[PDB]
Design a protein around this ligand. Structure first.
Ligand code: HEM
Ligand code: HEM
Ligand SMILES: CNCc1cc(OCc2ccc3ccc(N)nc3c2)ccc1Cl
Ligand SMILES: CNCc1cc(OCc2ccc3ccc(N)nc3c2)ccc1Cl
Ligand SMILES: C[C@H](O)[C@H](O)[C@H]1CNc2nc(N)[nH]c(=O)c2N1
Ligand SMILES: C[C@H](O)[C@H](O)[C@H]1CNc2nc(N)[nH]c(=O)c2N1
Ligand SMILES: [Zn+2]
Lengths: 411, 407
């Protein structure tokens, strides 16, 4: 079964045959589409087919399908599964799996970069302190004095699910939030709950509007521990605007390294509950979401005020005006400090090229339109007019519940 | 199976039960989501009719009543006898208001019940059609105080006699292929502007020439008609801050009146059913002016603003885009023509969602189409989870008439 997708600005039409390799479900049925829903212990019984399928994929990519190298690996993994109830990935296999999870991420606009991914094998890690060491190295390498490099660090896979390695933070670097008695929030509203945990776990909080949270790390299913990232490793950028000299006086900064640390990496049926990975920011992540979402730093009002905007009727589009300026500032500040960042036009254009290339070379490129289209100026980026097919391939990055909701406390 | 939707900006949760009444299909499966794809007999007809009449008599609190059963019987008889049937005016009105209500891509549905239905089922000719349309245009325009309306021409019979309005909107600007290679007027209407010329229209070859009407009655060849200019309200576009704006020579028409869709009620197919409301600002400003495949005025506007167009990261496309959309809203408001901004409209739609969840048990919505084409995440709909499914009565798409019409 072939499937065509069309781009209504260029009339370019592409055919998908890759969706036939799709395993997991979408949340959708013939009678309901849930494409806008945000969030729609494993036995040997189901493990080996996942192993085989994965290993068949792997040996195809290295062009050794059916070889003795292929077959003996299957034989090896097989035996290890019924003997030990799990199995270990070779280094080559781990690397492949990670890159491909990235490549399979249907919600990711940055996947043109997927082949260049520095994989750090942290599978020999046994403790929280060990975790801290690995993570510090990750940051230092990834940051690279502002010239950011994609990377992922991979901690021990899940076994019986009672011995999970988890990074409790949603991103390695992120600013504290503090609900005040009066109801106002200080710092980042997104991280209030996590800050409370951290504070409870012993963290002494500076209580400023921009405090870098401590790492909260759990190894082998033990109670998580706190660690301060050395400040010298945390690259931040003061936000200024090129024309408005009062912008700097708003006192905004942001960190340079987006490093997501709460997702689950699945490869050949193996689950990696701690797999922090990092790239570089698209400006609208900071400029549109981080500053301008109502449930976040919410500076729209103050920026609009300082710009003397007609804030009386929304039909003055003051909100829209202030948003654009804030995004201009974010990009200007990062480029001025030589810290890698991409604007939303550049990134969406790159993605379209990537995707075209993926259809030609791979038979498709699963993509979630709801997530790919940037949160401002949608229709003036080329992805808005791009039809996209959404489906799920393994290896994949998956959501997993907040560890504080599931963890069994020792003492 | 009793689905929940969450707004991630306000933590509001609504439970959807209304989807379980869904009749048509989505294009999606458990293996593939197609939510971003633009367009995925006597025995057939009675079930369809019964479902409609069931919901109608339920809506008037007469479910299972004698009147219900009597009507169900009467229609059942007519179908057996005539291989079709006719809607009582009340059913027709109910069905139209509900097809709008069920339009999952429409951000405007808060207004759904205040729709004026003009029954044009007695119409027989294209001339008759023209008269009905003129009347619709004048009622709806209402000197700039726009009112929603739909005019419904005879339903389909045997497919050989359909009524069709060939224009996609009653009012749209012509577009012509320049020898110089580019495009003058509206590029989206080039083939139609040709077909009108190709059918005898005398194009003034301008930039904003109102297209003529191509009306087809009873499966006949379509006829040309000019809307009386005094009925076409237009708005010159000026910026409230930039005086140079006026010299770009831009205007737009006030009445958005979609005319190429098929209205389906109780299994019957109204292939000619032009309807109209009022514009959300972005429809003209973001889409009609700045889409590359349209009037694409972005570059030129930005130039007038002397923005750094050397690198994409100066966000100059974004800056201009806002100003353009400010001007559109400013012009319409100043000339007292009804228009809504995307902040106001989306806010209303969330409130309308609330209402439909409460009073009806849900509200089908297509996020890809509800979220405006600019400033997406600073509108409430962006963080609003939605469920998409298809209820009847509905507006469906239908092929362009030329591709089908037996001449
Ligand atoms: C290097 C440059 C990259 C850019 C510019 C980029 C950009 C983005 C953006 C903007 C999102 C949506 C975020 C949001 O607004 O919520 C996203 C999603 C995502 N990215 Fe990328 N990304 C990059 C690299 C990576 C890397 C290195 C990985 C992993 C190896 C990755 C994996 C993902 C995944 C799994 C999602 C889905 C988020 C979810 O499902 O919640 N990305 N990307
Ligand atoms: C009264 C004010 C109204 C507003 C502000 C409004 C707004 C909108 C907008 C912005 C769209 C997206 C269209 C696009 O971007 O091309 C849309 C689609 C739609 N509207 Fe509404 N509308 C209004 C009235 C109506 C009326 C009176 C009807 C029918 C009786 C209607 C039925 C529809 C349908 C069926 C669609 C989607 C068509 C499709 O499936 O492609 N609307 N509307
Ligand atoms: C269910 N919520 C999804 C969600 C995903 C998130 O991860 C987004 C994400 C993931 C990987 C990224 C990699 C690079 C980059 N520049 N941004 C990236 C952004 C963040 C917040 C939320 Cl709320
Ligand atoms: C650019 N949009 C494409 C498209 C629009 C369509 O109708 C848009 C439409 C329909 C009804 C409307 C009613 C009011 C209004 N302001 N806009 C309205 C816009 C139908 C099919 C397609 Cl493919
Ligand atoms: C590719 C995508 O399906 C297509 O461009 C859609 C996206 N969302 C839209 N939304 C509206 N309101 N109108 C449109 O024409 C479109 N186009
Ligand atoms: C309800 C909806 O799915 C949700 O708000 C999505 C919309 N699109 C998004 N797109 C990006 N890039 N990031 C997001 O968090 C979201 N949120
Ligand atoms: Zn779907």
């Amino acid at each position: 079964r072939f499937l065509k997708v069309k781009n209504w600005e260029t009339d370019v039409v592409l055919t998908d045959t890759l969706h036939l390799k799709s395993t997991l479900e979408t949340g959708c049925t013939e009678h309901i589409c849930m494409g806008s829903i945000m969030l729609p212990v494993r036995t040997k019984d189901q493990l080996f087919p996942l192993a085989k399928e994965f290993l068949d994929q792997y040996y195809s990519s290295i062009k050794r399908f059916g070889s003795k190298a292929h077959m003996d690996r299957l034989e090896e993994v097989n035996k290890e599964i019924e003997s030990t109830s799990t199995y270990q990935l070779k280094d080559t296999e781990l690397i492949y799996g990670a890159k491909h999870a990235w490549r399979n991420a249907s919600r990711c606009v940055g996947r043109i970069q997927w082949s260049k991914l520095q994989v750090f094998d942290a599978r020999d890690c046994t403790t929280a302190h060990g975790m801290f060491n690995y993570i510090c190295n990750h940051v230092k390498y990834a940051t690279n004095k502002g010239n950011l490099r994609s990377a992922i660090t991979i901690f021990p896979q899940r076994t019986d699910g009672k011995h999970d390695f988890r990074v409790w933070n949603s991103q390695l670097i992120r600013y504290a939030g503090y609900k005040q008695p009066d109801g106002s929030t200080l710092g980042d509203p997104a991280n209030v709950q996590f800050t409370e945990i951290c504070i409870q776990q012993g963290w002494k909080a500076p209580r400023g509007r921009f405090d870098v949270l401590p790492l909260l790390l759990q190894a082998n299913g033990n109670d998580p521990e706190l660690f301060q990232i050395p400040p010298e490793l945390v690259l931040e950028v003061p936000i200024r605007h090129p024309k408005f000299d009062w912008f700097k006086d708003l006192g905004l900064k942001w960190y340079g390294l987006p490093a997501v640390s709460n997702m689950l990496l699945e490869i050949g049926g193996l689950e990696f509950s701690a797999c922090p990975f990092s790239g570089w920011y698209m400006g609208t992540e900071i400029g549109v979401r981080d500053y301008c979402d109502n449930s976040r730093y919410n500076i729209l009002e103050e920026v609009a005020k300082k710009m003397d905007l007609d804030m009386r009727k929304t039909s003055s589009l003051w909100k829209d005006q202030a948003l654009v300026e804030i995004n201009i500032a974010v990009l200007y500040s990062f480029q001025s400090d030589k810290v890698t960042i991409v604007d939303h036009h550049s990134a969406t254009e790159s993605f379209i090229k990537h995707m075209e290339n993926e259809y030609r070379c791979r038979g498709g490129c699963p993509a979630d339109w709801v997530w790919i289209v940037p949160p401002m100026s949608g229709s003036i980026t080329p992805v808005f007019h791009q039809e996209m097919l959404n489906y799920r391939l393994t290896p994949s990055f998956e959501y997993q519940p907040d560890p504080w909701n599931t963890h069994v406390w020792k003492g």
